[PDB]
RNA sequence: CUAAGAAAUUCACGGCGGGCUUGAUGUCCGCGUCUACCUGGUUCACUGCCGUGUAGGCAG
C-alpha cells in the first residue's frame, strides 16, 4: 500500500511536467483543490494575494482524498478486526496518511 | 567507501546514442560500471585540481526507449542499425549488429572533498556541471543544454553535516526533484538468500537469474505468483579468470604502462525502486572495488537497505 | 618510433539527432511550439517493374505474375494540410583536444604526433577547416533530400555561452551552394568562433535551426533504419522510419556526415564537389572507394610519413589528415 | 570453439570413442591405451597425440587485436588492470538450451 | 560497354496526399471550411455469390451456407446528406533536372546517359510530355471511381510561389474528355509551366482542387489499405479506408499513378486508351502487360539499346523513356 | 579513463470489386442524512481630478 502511494506520487511527478497552462478553466472545480499536488504554473492574473486560489499551499484535504481512497480501496467489514491485523489495516491506513501528509506538507510551496 | 560529506545531483542528464546491450545476455539499461567509470573519469579531470573524491553513483532512469522493432508479430525483437562506411573493395561492409538506445538519467554522487571547506558551494557545483557535458558515459554523447537547462543548476546538498531533522528534510529536499524515475539498486543479499532458500531442487548458481526474467507459476491442480518487484539480471562485475600480464608480455594493450587481464562477465540482479522506498539516499551508491587475489573485479552497492 | 597498433580518436563536431516540426512561413520566428511531424502509416500495392533476367522473360508468365502483385505497408511523414515549412533543430558541440588520441600505445609515436599537430596549429590556424565546416552549417546540407526542390531554405545559427544567445547569424542556404566554398562577412566571425573553440581549450555549443519551405502537405524524408527480414511475406517490407519523441528525426551520424563533406583535394576531378572525409575516401552515392592504396593519397600513408618518416605532404592535402582526426576513427590494422 | 578447423570429418569420427568410455580422457596425455588402440607403431600414434595435444593448445600468454574492447578497471586508490572481455559461446548456447526447452516444444504446448 | 548494376532516380513529379471533404455546389467558391468526409463503419451481411467447382456442392451445402452467417464490418464514407459535391485537394510540385540519376556505380555510364538526356532536351523540349501530363490534371483522372457517374467535374489549379496566387486555371473535366489529347490556349500555358519546372527554369508548386458533384448523400471512394481478413471472433473488419487527421483521403502514389497515364505508343493498340508509363507497361485492372520483353518496345530494351548500343528509339516512342525516367525507380541488376 | 574509441540505409509502387443481420422480453420491494458557525480577504498595497510631469481641496 505504501508502494501504491509511491506510485501515486510518481503519477503526480509525471503530471508535474506536462502542464504548461495550469490555472482556472472549464473543468477545474475539483481541480482547484485537486491542483495542490499537481501545482500548475503561476497565474499572471493573480494579485499580491495570489496565495489563495492560484498559490494554494493547503495540502490538508489531500489527506481527505487519501482517506477517501483508503475507504474505497477495500470494504472494511464490521467484524473483520478480531485479530491484531484488522484494526491494523486502519493503523496502516493512518501510516499511509501520515506519509501523505509529510509528502504534501510543502506541495504548493 | 563511506557516506559522503555532500551529495551532488544533476537533474536531467539527457544522454543520447548510448550502448544498449552492454553484456552478451541483456539489452536494456546499460551497465552500472559504465557510470562508475564515468565518475572516475570525472574525478580524474576535475578533482585533482578541485580536491574532491567520488566513489558511488545513483541511477534514477527517467525515460528509456530503444531502437528496437518487432519482426512480423513474433515473440521476439530486433535492433535498428547504422550504416558502416564502404569497404576497401567497395561493395558493402562487414555489417555488425549492436544495440543503441537513447535514455535519460540523473546521477548523484559521493564526495570526500572541500566543496564547502576551502571553496564555495555553487561555484564547485556549477563548474562540475558545466564540465560534465563534454564527455561520453555509455558510448554515447550527452545531449547538451537546451530548454532542459532551465531546472538544471543545482545545490551541493550536504549530508554529513546538519541537524538530524534537517538531515531528513535535506535528503527529501533532494527527493522532491526526483519523482517520475525509478532508481536502480542491487539485491546482493536477495541473490544470496533467494538462491539458498530455493535450493530444494538443485544447487546451481548461474540458474538464479536464468530463472527470474519469466512468469514463474505452479498453477492450480489462474493465480499469478507474487512478484516482489522487477526481477531482472544485471552485469554485476568482472571475474578475471586468467592471471595477470605485462605490457611487454601481451602486446596490443591501450597504454604500455598498465597491466592486462582477460576477463569475463558476472550476473547479479538489480531491482528497480521508487526513491521514496529507501532508507536514505547515501544507502544506494554503486561503489567499486577490485580483489586481485581472486578474479573478482566487482562493483557493488554496500548497504542497499 | 613505430605505428601505435591500438590507435583511435574521438568525435569532434558531434551533433545530435534533429527533430522535425512543421508550420507556416512568416510565423517562423515563433517556432518553439510547432507540432511534431510524426511518422504515419499507409500501404502500397506494387507491381513488377524490376529488371528481370535476360533470358527468363516468358511473355505469359509475366502476365500471370502481374495479376498477383506484391503488398507493402510502407511509412511516410507528411506535413499537415495547414503547414508550409519544416523546422530542423539539433545541438552541436566540439570537445577540444584535437590531436590527442583517446587510445595510443607508443609514447614515441604520440610524442612525434604532439609536435606534429602543435606546429600545424602554430603554423596556421584552422580557418581553412573553419570555413569548410562552416559551409556545412551555413548552407543546409544536413537536411539531405529536403534541400532539393525547396523554394526557400535557410538556416538560423545562434551560439550560446549562458542559457541565451551570445551571437546569432541568419543565412540563406541556397545562395551559397553545396559545391563552392566562399568567404563572407557574416561567416568569418563564425569561423573564428568554431576555430578557436575547436582547438584544445574546452567546449563550444551551437544550436542549428533550419527552415526548409518544402511545400504544402508534401512529404519529408526522415532517415530509415536497417532491419533483418521479418517472418511474413505480407508485412515483409515496412520502411520503418526514425522517431525520437513520437517525432520524425534524422540520425546523428547522417547529420554529422553532412558536416563532414570537406575535401575537394581528392585527385580524380573537381566535378563531384566535396565528399565525406574518410580513411580510404569512399562515397555511398558513387559506389567505389576513391584514393586507392596504390596512389599515395590514402590516410595511413600521409599520417605515417608526416609523423614517422617526417616527410611532410603539401599543405593542399594536409587538411585531409586533420579533418579525419576531427572525424576520428579506429586505426591500426 | 571455431578456430580454423575446416575438416569436420576428421573430428567427427573421433568423438564417439568417449561417449560411454574414457577415450575423451586421452585428449591431452597419458595415451597408453591410446597407443595400444592404434595397431601401429609409436610414429602414427605420436602424430595422433600431437593432433590431440594441439586441439586444446594453451600457451598461457595470448595475443590481442586493437578492437578487443580493452577496458580500464580502477583499483582501490591504486593503479589500473586493463580488462578485455570476450563472448562466451557455449555459455550463450547453454542459455539457448534452457530457453529453447522452455519457449516451444514441451512447455509452450 | 558495360551497364550499371545499381542505379536509381528521384521521382521528378511528386504530389501530396489528397484529403477529401464534401459540400454543396455553387457555394463551392467559399470552400475553405468544408468539413471532412469522415470514415464511419457499418455492418454488412454476406451471402453466396462465388463460383463453386462442385467438389462439395451437395443438396445441403448451399442451403446450409445461406443460413450460416458471414456477417462483416466494412468501412464506408458517405457525404453529408445535404451535400452533393466532393472536394479533393492535393498539392503537386515538380523538382527538375530530369535525367540526372541519384546513385550510380560507373562514372562512364552516367556521363553518356546525362548527355543522352541533354541531346534529347535540346533536340526537343519537354513540351509534348508536359502536355500529356497536363491532360491528366485537366481531365480529372485522379478522381478514380469518384468521377464515373458524376454529373459535373471541374478542376481549380492555382500557382503558388509565395503565399499568393500567380495564375489560375478552371478546367471543365468532362467537356474535354479522357480519350483524346487536344490542346487549348489556356491548357498550353499550364503545359508551359510544367515544361519549365521539368527543364530546370523555375521551381513550380501547384495545388489542384477537384469539385466532383455526385449527389445528395451518395458514396465516395477514397483509398483502401491492405485488408486484414484475420482469425475473427465470427465477423471482423474486411475493408478499411485511408484516414488522416479526421479526414478520409487518397494515397499520393494513386494520384501520381493517375497523373502519369501517358503512353499510347504501345504496340497492341493505340486508340483504346492511354495507360500508365512503367517498365513492361502493365495494367492491374486489364491484368496484362503491354510492351512485353518479347517485343522491343518496353523500357529495359530501349534504354540499353539507346545508351549503350547507340540506336535511336524512333522519336515517336523516345518520349516513353524520358517519362519513365521522370517516374524514377530502381534500375540495374 | 565507460563492451570506450568510428560510421549516409537507399531508390519507386492502384488494394479492389460485391452484400437482408434479423425475431422476441415485467427491473423488482423499503428507507431520518442530521448538529455547529462574523468573510469588515485587498471579490485589483483601490477610486474622478489643478501643468499632456507624482506636485491637491475628492462621493475619499
Curated annotation (Swiss-Prot), chain A:
Disruption-associated phenotype: Mutants lose phage DMS3 infection-dependent inhibition of biofilm formation while there is normal biofilm formation in the absence of phage infection. Decreased production of crRNA in the presence or absence of phage. Disruption of the entire Y.pestis-subtype CRISPR region disrupts crRNA production but does not alter phage resistance (possibly OLNs PA14_33350 to PA14_33310, and the flanking CRISPR loci), indicating this CRISPR is not involved in phage resistance.
Entry similarity comment: Belongs to the CRISPR-associated Csy1 family.
Purpose of the protein: CRISPR (clustered regularly interspaced short palindromic repeat) is an adaptive immune system that provides protection against mobile genetic elements (viruses, transposable elements and conjugative plasmids). CRISPR clusters contain sequences complementary to antecedent mobile elements and target invading nucleic acids. CRISPR clusters are transcribed and processed into CRISPR RNA (crRNA). Cas3 and Cascade participate in CRISPR interference, the third stage of CRISPR immunity (Potential). Involved in crRNA production or stability.
Quaternary structure and partners: Interacts directly with Csy2; part of the Csy ribonucleoprotein complex with a probable stoichiometry of Csy1(1),Csy2(1),Csy3(6),Cas6/Csy4(1)-crRNA(1). A Csy3(6),Cas6/Csy4(1)-crRNA(1) subcomplex is also formed.
Miscellaneous comment: In this bacteria, Y.pestis-subtype CRISPRs do not confer resistance to phage DMS3 or MP22, but instead are required for DMS3 infection-dependent inhibition of biofilm formation and possibly motility.
Name of the featured protein: CRISPR-associated protein Csy1
Species for this entry: Pseudomonas aeruginosa (strain UCBPP-PA14)
From Swiss-Prot, chain B:
GO BP: any one term: defense response to virus
InterPro entries named among the record's database cross-references: CRISPR-assoc_prot_Csy2
One Pfam assignment: Cas_Csy2
Keywords attached to this entry: Antiviral defense
Knocked-out gene: effects: Mutants lose phage DMS3 infection-dependent inhibition of biofilm formation while there is normal biofilm formation in the absence of phage infection. Loss of production of crRNA in the presence or absence of phage. Disruption of the entire Y.pestis-subtype CRISPR region disrupts crRNA production but does not alter phage resistance (possibly OLNs PA14_33350 to PA14_33310, and the flanking CRISPR loci), indicating this CRISPR is not involved in phage resistance.
NCBIfam families: cas_Csy2
Note: In this bacteria, Y.pestis-subtype CRISPRs do not confer resistance to phage DMS3 or MP22, but instead are required for DMS3 infection-dependent inhibition of biofilm formation and possibly motility.
Function: CRISPR (clustered regularly interspaced short palindromic repeat) is an adaptive immune system that provides protection against mobile genetic elements (viruses, transposable elements and conjugative plasmids). CRISPR clusters contain sequences complementary to antecedent mobile elements and target invading nucleic acids. CRISPR clusters are transcribed and processed into CRISPR RNA (crRNA). Cas3 and Cascade participate in CRISPR interference, the third stage of CRISPR immunity (Potential). Absolutely required for crRNA production or stability.
Subunit note: Interacts directly with Csy1; part of the Csy ribonucleoprotein complex with a probable stoichiometry of Csy1(1),Csy2(1),Csy3(6),Cas6/Csy4(1)-crRNA(1). A Csy3(6),Cas6/Csy4(1)-crRNA(1) subcomplex is also formed.
Family per similarity comment: Belongs to the CRISPR-associated Csy2 family.
Protein name: CRISPR-associated protein Csy2
Organism per entry: Pseudomonas aeruginosa (strain UCBPP-PA14)
Gene (UniProt): csy2
Curated annotation (Swiss-Prot), chains C, E:
Superkingdom in the source lineage: Bacteria
Positions in coiled-coil regions: none
Pfam entry (one): Cas_Csy3
BP GO annotations: defense response to virus
Keywords, in A-Z order: Antiviral defense
CDD domains: Csy3_I-F (cd09737)
Listed InterPro entries: CRISPR-assoc_prot_Csy3
Disruption phenotype: Mutants lose phage DMS3 infection-dependent inhibition of biofilm formation while there is normal biofilm formation in the absence of phage infection. Decreased production of crRNA in the presence or absence of phage. Disruption of the entire Y.pestis-subtype CRISPR region disrupts crRNA production but does not alter phage resistance (possibly OLNs PA14_33350 to PA14_33310, and the flanking CRISPR loci), indicating this CRISPR is not involved in phage resistance.
Subunit structure: Part of the Csy ribonucleoprotein complex with a probable stoichiometry of Csy1(1),Csy2(1),Csy3(6),Cas6/Csy4(1)-crRNA(1). A Csy3(6),Cas6/Csy4(1)-crRNA(1) subcomplex is also formed.
Function comment: CRISPR (clustered regularly interspaced short palindromic repeat) is an adaptive immune system that provides protection against mobile genetic elements (viruses, transposable elements and conjugative plasmids). CRISPR clusters contain sequences complementary to antecedent mobile elements and target invading nucleic acids. CRISPR clusters are transcribed and processed into CRISPR RNA (crRNA). Cas3 and Cascade participate in CRISPR interference, the third stage of CRISPR immunity (Potential). Involved in crRNA production or stability.
Family: Belongs to the CRISPR-associated Csy3 family.
Name assigned to this protein: CRISPR-associated protein Csy3
Origin species: Pseudomonas aeruginosa (strain UCBPP-PA14)
Phylogenetic placement of the source organism: Bacteria, Pseudomonadati, Pseudomonadota, Gammaproteobacteria, Pseudomonadales
Underlying gene: csy3
